[PDB]
Amino acid sequence: TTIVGVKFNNGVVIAADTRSTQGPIVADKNCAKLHRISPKIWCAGAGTAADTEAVTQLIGSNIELHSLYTSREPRVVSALQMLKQHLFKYQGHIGAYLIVAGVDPTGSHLFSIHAHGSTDVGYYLSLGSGSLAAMAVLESHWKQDLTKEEAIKLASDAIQAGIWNDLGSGSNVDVCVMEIGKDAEYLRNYLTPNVREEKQKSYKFPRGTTAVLKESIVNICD
Amino acid sequence: TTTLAFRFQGGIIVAVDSRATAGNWVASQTVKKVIEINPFLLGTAAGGAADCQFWETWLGSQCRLHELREKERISVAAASKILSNLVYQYKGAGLSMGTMICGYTRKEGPTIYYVDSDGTRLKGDIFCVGSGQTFAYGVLDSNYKWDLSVEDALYLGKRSILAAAHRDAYSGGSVNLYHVTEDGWIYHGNHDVGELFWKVKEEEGSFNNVIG
Amino acid sequence: GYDRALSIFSPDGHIFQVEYALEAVKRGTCAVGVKGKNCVVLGCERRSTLKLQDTRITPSKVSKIDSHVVLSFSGLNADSRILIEKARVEAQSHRLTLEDPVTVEYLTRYVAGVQQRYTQSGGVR
Amino acid sequence: TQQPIVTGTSVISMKYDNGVIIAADNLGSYGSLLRFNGVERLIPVGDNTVVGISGDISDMQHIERLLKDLVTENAYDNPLADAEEALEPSYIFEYLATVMYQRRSKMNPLWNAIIVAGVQSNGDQFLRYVNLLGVTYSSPTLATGFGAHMANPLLRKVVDRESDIPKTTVQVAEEAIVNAMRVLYYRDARSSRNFSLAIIDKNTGLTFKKNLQVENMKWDFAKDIKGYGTQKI
Amino acid sequence: SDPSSINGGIVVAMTGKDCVAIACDLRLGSQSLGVSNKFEKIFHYGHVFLGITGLATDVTTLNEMFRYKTNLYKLKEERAIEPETFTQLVSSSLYERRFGPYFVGPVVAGINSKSGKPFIAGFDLIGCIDEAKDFIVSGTASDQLFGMCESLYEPNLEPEDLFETISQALLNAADRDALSGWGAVVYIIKKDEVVKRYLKMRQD
Amino acid sequence: TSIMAVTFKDGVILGADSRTTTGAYIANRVTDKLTRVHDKIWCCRSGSAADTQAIADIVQYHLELYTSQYGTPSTETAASVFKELCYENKDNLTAGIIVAGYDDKNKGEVYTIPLGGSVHKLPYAIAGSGSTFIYGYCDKNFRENMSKEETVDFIKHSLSQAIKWDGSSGGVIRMVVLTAAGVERLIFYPDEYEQL
Amino acid sequence: MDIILGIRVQDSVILASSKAVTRGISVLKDSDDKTRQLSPHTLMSFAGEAGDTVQFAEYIQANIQLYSIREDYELSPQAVSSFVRQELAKSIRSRRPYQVNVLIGGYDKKKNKPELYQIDYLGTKVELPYGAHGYSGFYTFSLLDHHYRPDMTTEEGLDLLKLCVQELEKRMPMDFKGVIVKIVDKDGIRQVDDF
Amino acid sequence: MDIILGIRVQDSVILASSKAVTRGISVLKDSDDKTRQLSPHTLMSFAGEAGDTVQFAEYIQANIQLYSIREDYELSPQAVSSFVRQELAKSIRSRRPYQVNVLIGGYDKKKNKPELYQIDYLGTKVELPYGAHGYSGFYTFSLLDHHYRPDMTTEEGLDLLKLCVQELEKRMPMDFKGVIVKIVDKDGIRQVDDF
Amino acid sequence: QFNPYGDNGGTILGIAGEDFAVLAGDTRNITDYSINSRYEPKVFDCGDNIVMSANGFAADGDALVKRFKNSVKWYHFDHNDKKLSINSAARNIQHLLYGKRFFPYYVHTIIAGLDEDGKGAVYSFDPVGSYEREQCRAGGAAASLIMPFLDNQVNFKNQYEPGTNGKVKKPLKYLSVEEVIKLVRDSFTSATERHIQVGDGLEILIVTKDGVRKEFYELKRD
Numbered sequence A: 001t002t003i004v005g006v007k008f009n010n011g012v013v014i015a016a017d018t019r020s021t022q023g024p025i026v027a028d029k030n031c032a033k034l035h036r037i038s039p040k041i042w043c044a045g046a047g048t049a050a051d052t053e054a055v056t057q058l059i060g061s062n063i064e065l066h067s068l069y070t071s072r073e074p075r076v077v078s079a080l081q082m083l084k085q086h087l088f089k090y091q092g093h094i095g096a097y098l099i100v101a102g103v104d105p106t107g108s109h110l111f112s113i114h115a116h117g118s119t120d121v122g123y124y125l126s127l128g129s130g131s132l133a134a135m136a137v138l139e140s141h142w143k144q145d146l147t148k149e150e151a152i153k154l155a156s157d158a159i160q161a162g163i164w165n166d167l168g169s170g171s172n173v174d175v176c177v178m179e180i181g182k183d184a185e186y187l188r189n190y191l192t193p194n195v196r197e198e199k200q201k202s203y204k205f206p207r208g209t210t211a212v213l214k215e216s217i218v219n220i221c222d
Numbered sequence B: 001t002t003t004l005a006f007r008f009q010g011g012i013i014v015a016v017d018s019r020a021t022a023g024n025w026v027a028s029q030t031v032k033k034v035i036e037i038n039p040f041l042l043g044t045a046a047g048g049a050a051d052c053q054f055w056e057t058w059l060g061s062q063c064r065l066h067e068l069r070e071k072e073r074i075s076v077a078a079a080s081k082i083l084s085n086l087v088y089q090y091k092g093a094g095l096s097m098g099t100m101i102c103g104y105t106r107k108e109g110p111t112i113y114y115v116d117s118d119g120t121r122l123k124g125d126i127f128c129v130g131s132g133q134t135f136a137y138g139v140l141d142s143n144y145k146w147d148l149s150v151e152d153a154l155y156l157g158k159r160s161i162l163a164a165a166h167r168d169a170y171s172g173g174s175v176n177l178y179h180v181t182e183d184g185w186i187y188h189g190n191h192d193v194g195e196l197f198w199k200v201k202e203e204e205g206s207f208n209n210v211i212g
Numbered sequence C: 001g002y003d004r005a006l007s008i009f010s011p012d013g014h015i016f017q018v019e020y021a022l023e024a025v026k027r028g029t030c031a032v033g034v035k036g037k038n039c040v041v042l043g044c045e046r047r048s049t050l051k052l053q054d055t056r057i058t059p060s061k062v063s064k065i066d067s068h069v070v071l072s073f074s075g076l077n078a079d080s081r082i083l084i085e086k087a088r089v090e091a092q093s094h095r096l097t098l099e100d101p102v103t104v105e106y107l108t109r110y111v112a113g114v115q116q117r118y119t120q121s122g123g124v125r
Numbered sequence D: 001t002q003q004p005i006v007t008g009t010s011v012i013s014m015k016y017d018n019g020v021i022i023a024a025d026n027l028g029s030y031g032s033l034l035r036f037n038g039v040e041r042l043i044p045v046g047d048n049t050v051v052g053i054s055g056d057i058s059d060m061q062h063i064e065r066l067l068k069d070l071v072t073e074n075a076y077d078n079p080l081a082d083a084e085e086a087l088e089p090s091y092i093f094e095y096l097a098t099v100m101y102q103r104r105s106k107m108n109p110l111w112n113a114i115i116v117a118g119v120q121s122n123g124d125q126f127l128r129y130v131n132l133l134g135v136t137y138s139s140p141t142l143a144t145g146f147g148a149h150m151a152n153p154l155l156r157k158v159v160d161r162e163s164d165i166p167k168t169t170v171q172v173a174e175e176a177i178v179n180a181m182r183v184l185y186y187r188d189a190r191s192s193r194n195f196s197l198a199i200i201d202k203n204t205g206l207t208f209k210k211n212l213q214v215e216n217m218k219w220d221f222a223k224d225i226k227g228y229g230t231q232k233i
Numbered sequence E: 001s002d003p004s005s006i007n008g009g010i011v012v013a014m015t016g017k018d019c020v021a022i023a024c025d026l027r028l029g030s031q032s033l034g035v036s037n038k039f040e041k042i043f044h045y046g047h048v049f050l051g052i053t054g055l056a057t058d059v060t061t062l063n064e065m066f067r068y069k070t071n072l073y074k075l076k077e078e079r080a081i082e083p084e085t086f087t088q089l090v091s092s093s094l095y096e097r098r099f100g101p102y103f104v105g106p107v108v109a110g111i112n113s114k115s116g117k118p119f120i121a122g123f124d125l126i127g128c129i130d131e132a133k134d135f136i137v138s139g140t141a142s143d144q145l146f147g148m149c150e151s152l153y154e155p156n157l158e159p160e161d162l163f164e165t166i167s168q169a170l171l172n173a174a175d176r177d178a179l180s181g182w183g184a185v186v187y188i189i190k191k192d193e194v195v196k197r198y199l200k201m202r203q204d
Numbered sequence F: 001t002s003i004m005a006v007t008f009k010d011g012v013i014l015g016a017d018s019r020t021t022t023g024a025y026i027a028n029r030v031t032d033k034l035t036r037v038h039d040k041i042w043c044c045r046s047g048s049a050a051d052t053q054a055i056a057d058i059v060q061y062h063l064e065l066y067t068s069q070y071g072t073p074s075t076e077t078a079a080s081v082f083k084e085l086c087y088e089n090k091d092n093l094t095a096g097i098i099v100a101g102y103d104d105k106n107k108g109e110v111y112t113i114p115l116g117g118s119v120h121k122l123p124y125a126i127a128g129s130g131s132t133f134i135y136g137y138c139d140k141n142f143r144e145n146m147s148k149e150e151t152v153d154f155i156k157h158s159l160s161q162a163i164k165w166d167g168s169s170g171g172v173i174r175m176v177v178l179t180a181a182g183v184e185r186l187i188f189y190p191d192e193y194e195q196l
Numbered sequence G, H: 001m002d003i004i005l006g007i008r009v010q011d012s013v014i015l016a017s018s019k020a021v022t023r024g025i026s027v028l029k030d031s032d033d034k035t036r037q038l039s040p041h042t043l044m045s046f047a048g049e050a051g052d053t054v055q056f057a058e059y060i061q062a063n064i065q066l067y068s069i070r071e072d073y074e075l076s077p078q079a080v081s082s083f084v085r086q087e088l089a090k091s092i093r094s095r096r097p098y099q100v101n102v103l104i105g106g107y108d109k110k111k112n113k114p115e116l117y118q119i120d121y122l123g124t125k126v127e128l129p130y131g132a133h134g135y136s137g138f139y140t141f142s143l144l145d146h147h148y149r150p151d152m153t154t155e156e157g158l159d160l161l162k163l164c165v166q167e168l169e170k171r172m173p174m175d176f177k178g179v180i181v182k183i184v185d186k187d188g189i190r191q192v193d194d195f
Numbered sequence I: 001q002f003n004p005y006g007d008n009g010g011t012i013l014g015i016a017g018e019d020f021a022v023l024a025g026d027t028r029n030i031t032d033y034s035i036n037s038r039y040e041p042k043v044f045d046c047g048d049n050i051v052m053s054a055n056g057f058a059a060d061g062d063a064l065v066k067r068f069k070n071s072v073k074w075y076h077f078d079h080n081d082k083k084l085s086i087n088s089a090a091r092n093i094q095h096l097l098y099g100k101r102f103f104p105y106y107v108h109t110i111i112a113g114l115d116e117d118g119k120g121a122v123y124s125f126d127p128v129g130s131y132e133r134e135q136c137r138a139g140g141a142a143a144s145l146i147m148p149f150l151d152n153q154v155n156f157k158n159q160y161e162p163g164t165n166g167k168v169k170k171p172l173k174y175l176s177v178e179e180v181i182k183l184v185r186d187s188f189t190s191a192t193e194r195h196i197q198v199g200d201g202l203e204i205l206i207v208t209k210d211g212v213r214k215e216f217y218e219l220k221r222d
Ligand SMILES: *[C@@](C)(CO)[C@](*)(O)[C@H](CC(C)C)NC(=O)[C@H](Cc1ccccc1)NC(=O)[C@H](CC(C)C)NC(=O)[C@H](CCc1ccccc1)NC(=O)CN1CCOCC1
Pocket: A001, A002, A019, A020, A021, A022, A023, A027, A028, A031, A033, A045, A046, A047, A048, A049, A050, A052, A095, A128, A129, A168, A169, E004, E103, E104, E105, E123, E124, E125, E126, E128, E129, E130
């Protein structure tokens, strides 16, 4: 994976590639690594795929119940605290590496969480196998007082660096923009620079090519 | 691999499969596991593909040099012992070879020698070698008689490989048949298991475990 | 190691050391071989200037190389032992690898090959 | 079988329209200890080749001696030693590549990653990599260690394929290299601020720059970062 | 002693025009020894089809488990479970055993009875969902199946054409794997009819 | 890490670098290793980031609950809670923590807690991988009852050398001043401290 | 424990189980019956780790006999095999698993059909026309592939079984001291005394 | 390779050697002769690592036959055993030792006495009235301690040997496919064809 | 401890026609998750109408190709400029490979050309020298993906004649150079999609009686 997070004027943006690997094999060419914890708190996940999904849903569930209990919109630090304490308890065995971001009544926020339960604060962050390719771009082009459109460009450029240069990352670029006072916009497949070219030949077989031994109608009804 | 060769009234039958594996990866279905050393000598190949192929090719060169020097075809015993003495020099180095040197000479008659990479050399009437040797033995032993006809012996050899090709996951592809007589070896064709299995199942009425 | 080429060609195309080795054979006691229809017989001369000999223990002129092959000779007695020994070893080595005793032609060919090797090897006569 | 003791980190390089640029910092690390600070890891061979070496420094110094000796040996009985029969980058590389692979094959490797940058006699750019395993490859941009992970991505944005080489000037190319060196100083724990840079041009020849420093760094934003999550002071 | 490759086997699922196909081999072995040539790896709960590769004892255990859970679902909900919902149930159940997992590679396939949309999905052994428009693969010849499906597949295939594509994908992949084959079954699934075909393949 | 805490005339100053590493990669170059467990009780964190955070969070919780019942805790009390966690979970922790705080009665105090979980009250303390290189320097240059400006220079020069030699240390030099006046944060950038 | 075979024919299930009990370099017993009657028309043979085998077999037997008394009814071979599989499926993820492989031969009185189930220690169940555990299969399966027919009589099944035992006695390394053969049919379970 | 026995009686030495050659789960041969004639009145049986056994046996045989031709004289069993021991004693400290255990049964024509020597792969020689290699000894030694007498005839020795083979066939785990028995006496070496 | 081997990834493919033969291979060179070169050729013209590729550990691959090229040179010197036949080349390569039986060249070797009857020939080698002539062979990282597709499309495996009740097989026939290149390109695009070590570029070398031609095609760079 390659995942990034970038702060800007009036909020925060996160992004991710869409490759899912199984050893050297690409299992999913267009998986979604951006997760919704609450309406305006989103999470980019790298590492063990089942773990990032499971841990984000569990904390997202508890955040919803907490939001209903307290009659308040949930805060990023609550998700951050609940995630890190969960991950720390499991001593790194739950392999979730997360970039947690969002807006809440306190303001806009950007954090990262590692599998062992350590958290970091920053204006720009990157995790995953292609984090070094992404961080190289972020270190080269990031500045203070980014606009919305500049942060999206920087974020997607950092993901692209991972896509092209890291074998662990590829396919498309997902983006989620969380601006203060506005609804969070989830931009699924924001860029699709890896479209499969037309095949040279159709491999549609003549009907009857496959040898059959038996046929039977299957009963699905009661 | 599965390879066999047995001695009988009408000479020697030799049968082998043609599969080659690298773990669970089926690398080839068309490997020649019988080496034609000369018009009267055959060698079978099981174990490491390179080890067998390289050293049995080498054996053929040593047998050629024998008949140049001695003006006489090498004995099956002497040929098998060249190979066994060779692999014994490499004992412990990790060679993996399960071979059978089959042939006819005037002084010996039809003869089969089992030779393997840990130095074992055995004369015998029946041998099965390879990962599916036990499956071949099961069919071969239960149907073997010395008084088999050339036609029945050829079939039993073929059927024994087929049995192993079916059950053993690391055997298959096709069956290569050979018949060795006083006049030399005779090739009896390549038989793909893809067609041979169903042909045998129907005609013989066997393989009732499989969905027909 | 002693390297000198002792056996060499002369202007007239002769290897004198090989030819002088034949003179040593000509000096040696006579030996004869006659083969019949179903047998071979090896006859050997023993010079009678040596009385007070012990014939029990004195090296016999005819030597068994294997149970089926024999070797007699004429010439230097000490030299013959070296050939006989080499031949006997090769006889056992053949049985070990070929699983069959040597033919008389093969054993001869080996012995003859040893003799030849000493005609173009350095340091040896 | 070895283990590297005193080590040198990333060597980065790229092609541009008229030649090649190569750079490497001046550090000799002893594990986590930043032991030696005056180490030159770019070694020129003649006036047309520069060999950049990372990894074990004792082995680097051995390679220096071999290259030094190669120049001497080439001069022997060679009236055209400073002309047609001068040492080419391709000759120097193939020699090293032969040695590196022979040493790995004897299970006693020179624990290094090497990049031979230069310009051939016909004006063509030469840039090729070789390492302790004897593995060789060429590319418009080449880098070792952390450079491979962080520099290459940045340098490939300038020269992504062959056709981008004529379009890249020495000004643009050097700027990218100097930027990459800064990024490596931010992020590589065994890097130093001081570095050397070499340009081999087909027109202006060999330019060897010493005692360069990473500058125009962004650190100001650090003051705003407090705690690791909740903390507000 | 690698649980996922003791028994062997494969499953593949594809989508077509208003239809889905799911197929599997019939082999069950103990490493090199072939034991059974009748071991089907595809099950169904109502109109939702589940294929499972991997350790055979877990394949059986999970089938029995999902039959259990879907039966209770139906009694309480008073309707058949849908593929999207079942996929979530499989994921939940597998991740529940996160640190002592079932050694399996399940594959969901079916058509949503409300929307009529063809649906397929795959999972790893700890329940990570792998959703796909085109195809899902699983088993000891997954690499082979990935190669076959990626080249042979095209979108919007008719049920009769889709049958040929998925069958050829399975057959040729199985023939390059020692632990897969020994027969094969293909399910063609339309909105309100399901056809099951047994394929003739080489028996080695 | 390179961390230190130094007592002086008006109170105590904590100091730290800003480098977090995974092997030789710098995961964070602007880390804040100086963390608040109470108004005027802070700590320097070295070792595992996860462990030291988890510990500091628990200590902050304990001292907040202490304050609700018994009022402001002593710096010694804070160090005791750190010790209790580090000692009792020594098998599962990699944390080198320096506790520093300002009382009005006790003035500036520094307690260092190494891996084992032992407590050591000292005039000043150094810790973290890069501390090894400045034992010689700090011993020769430390004086009791220094001024604020002298103590800042002592920490700055010390961590500058630690950073210079230790690859595992770098970035900015953060400092936190604890006196009767209040809490002051200080930062010092490479361009300044490197050429000292 | 080593050789256990099973052959389902037209009207019966035949189980053959080796008599040897070796431990070390000593054959301690040569007349061991490696089977338990679970119910009047259900028989289970077993092979595996010492102690585990009998302990498991008797535990299953006790449970099936308890069911029979409670319901005054005999469980079907299919039902018994499913119960056994589940017990082994639990076992494999226990602190100390039962290392026992079993064959369950039974005659279903409701269907009037013989049934043979092969279950390994992992809980891997398969219904088969013929089955084996351990190294036996490597010889017998290929042999039965050839000679077995589905419509065979019990007498034909015994001859087919003799053919297996002969092959094993010829090619197996260890002396397993022959086999105890038992037949399961509509009339229940009986032992062949002369084999 | 597994079972090799030897019994010295009044006027002869009797060697019994198992016929089985096993490898993996397959008995490859059941008529193997694990012995070589070193000289007309000296016989050596052998057992151990595959390949090593025959290679070593034939190497010794070649050397003894070479000696016989050279001197036109048969070496004594004592002399042959000492030669064999030295070869094994060298071997054990080689790069790759011969892992071969041997029994040397011979009839000394000068003494008119039978002689049995037991030599292991380390080069450990002992002259014995009865001997065995491998696990065989664990049964046969105690049996022979009881039943053996020094003045027994060849026929009594064969009955005593039958008693050993029976015990081994009863209690040994592996099927060794019977034995080839050979007798060494004043008249040389001969094989018992019906055992 | 020093490990003398490495994995440089990539994949190769050889197909034989009636009067021609192709040997294709991607141009990507990798170590772990990093790209070393997007264009590093590993299919070489070795003279005498023999093309060769030794995919796997590049250092061993280059060494082998270098040595075989040299073997061809000395074959000319020692045998009066005689043309090295493809069958003779294969046997020679077996001895090169087996020569290092106890410290192998970690490569899958494939050579292609024309046999002495003018017909297309492809030979494939394991790392220690076992070889076999075939109509078809894929080697390297994505060999497991490509090879079964080739069985189906080149050798018409599992394909029967429609309406013949799976009794008559699809008849074998030679493919045109145009049809073969279509299969090569589709094989490599498919392999690029699902294998991370395959991409960047595709270089095909075609061998006819006229000589050795080259064709290059772009592949996805993620
Ligand atoms: C980049 C793309 C680098 O991987 C990202 O970091 C992504 C994160 C996204 C998907 C959220 N990472 C992966 O895709 C991740 C890489 C990985 C692999 C293995 C361990 C850790 C990380 N891949 C996965 O998580 C896949 C997702 C599947 C393809 C849907 N899962 C697997 O590879 C599982 C790993 C399961 C696991 C078990 C125990 C501890 C850790 C992980 N592996 C298998 O399924 C392989 N095998 C199949 C046969 O059954 C036995 C297991």
